[PDB]
Amino acid sequence: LPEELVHAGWEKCWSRRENRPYYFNRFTNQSLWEMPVLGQHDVISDP
């Protein structure tokens, strides 16, 4: 998890119920199981 993910609030942790590590967005309380993504892709914006 590079500063890119840590910026959004993502944080790797060990879920006891799942008995393994994963990802938890402390910002949206999200709970994934594999490194998430970010705006690293293209920028589809026309402000």
State the residue range of the domain holding 20.
1-47
CATH code of the domain containing 30: 2.20.70.10
Q: Are 47 and 35 in contact (CB under 8 A)?
A: no
What is the 3-state secondary structure of 5-42? HHHHCCCEEEECCCCEEEEEECCCCEEECCCCCCCCCC
3-class SS of residue 2: coil
9's tokens: 């609030």
Looking at the chain, how many residues does it have? 47
Q: Are 8 and 37 in contact (CB under 8 A)?
A: no
Give the pairing type, strands 20-25 and 30-32. Answer: antiparallel
DSSP bridge pairs for 31: 24
Q: Experimental technique used?
A: NMR
Count CA within 13 A, CB hemisphere, residue 42: 3
Separation CA 20–CA 47 (nearest Å): 42
Q: Are 38 and 28 in contact (CB under 8 A)?
A: no
The total number of structural domains in the chain stands at: 1
8-state DSSP, 4: H
